[PDB]
């Protein structure tokens, strides 16, 4: 099992940071639960999360500041409304809900830099 994400992402002047979160192993029938966590001193804060049961579908509908899409082995994440205080480490967590066997994995985190707009 393995989840990976980019090391660094430079947010847009308007505070948008988009990047992929990839995982293995993957299958044609994958359905996943994706969770974005910000890591600080010893602890993590959940930023947003969503479930994807099919491709070509926009997720995180109930989170104004997160959006994303999904296809086998990859979740395209978008984090919005970022401010200077928000630069830091953001972990991507992926849970394979179907097909069995079940498994959970987490990336090493993407350093998001919100550079002086």
Residues that bind a copy of itself (CB under 8 A): 4-10, 12-14, 16, 18-20, 22, 56-58, 61, 67, 69, 71, 74, 76, 78
Q: Quick check: 87 binds Cl ion (CB under 5 A)?
A: no
Residues 7, 21 contacting (CB under 8 angstroms): no
Q: Provide the sign of the torsion angle of the four alpha carbons 41, 46, 48, 54, taken in this order.
A: positive
Least distance in Å: CB of 96 to Cl ion?
23
Output 94 or 96, the one with its CB closest to Cl ion.
Answer: 94
69 binds, among Cl ion, a copy of itself, none (CB under 5 to 8 A by kind): a copy of itself
Residue 50 DSSP code: E
State CA 25 to chain mean position distance: 17
User: Is residue 6 a contact residue for Cl ion (CB under 5 A)?
Assistant: yes
Subset of residues 19 to 38 that bind Cl ion, contact rule: CB under 5 A: 19
The residue with tokens 């979740």 is 75
Taking the C-alpha atoms of residue 79 and residue 61, their distance in angstroms, rounded to an integer, is 13
Q: Compute the least distance from the CB of residue 8 to a copy of itself, in Å.
A: 6
State phi, psi for 43 to the nearest 5 degrees: -115, 170
With contacts defined by CB under 5 A, name the span among 13-21, 33-41, 51-59, 97-105 that binds Cl ion.
Answer: 13-21
């Amino acid at each position: 099992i393995q989840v990976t994400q980019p090391s660094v992402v430079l947010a847009s002047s308007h505070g948008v940071a988009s990047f992929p979160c990839e995982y293995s192993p993957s299958h044609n029938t994958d359905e996943v639960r994706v969770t974005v966590l910000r890591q600080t001193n010893d602890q993590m804060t959940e930023v947003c999360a969503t479930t994807f049961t099919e491709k070509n579908t926009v997720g995180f509908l109930d989170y104004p500041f997160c959006s994303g899409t999904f296809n086998e082995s990859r979740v395209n994440l978008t984090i919005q409304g970022l401010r200077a205080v928000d630069t830091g480490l953001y972990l991507c967590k992926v849970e394979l809900m179907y097909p069995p066997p079940y498994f959970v994995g987490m990336g090493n985190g993407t350093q998001i830099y919100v550079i002086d707009p």
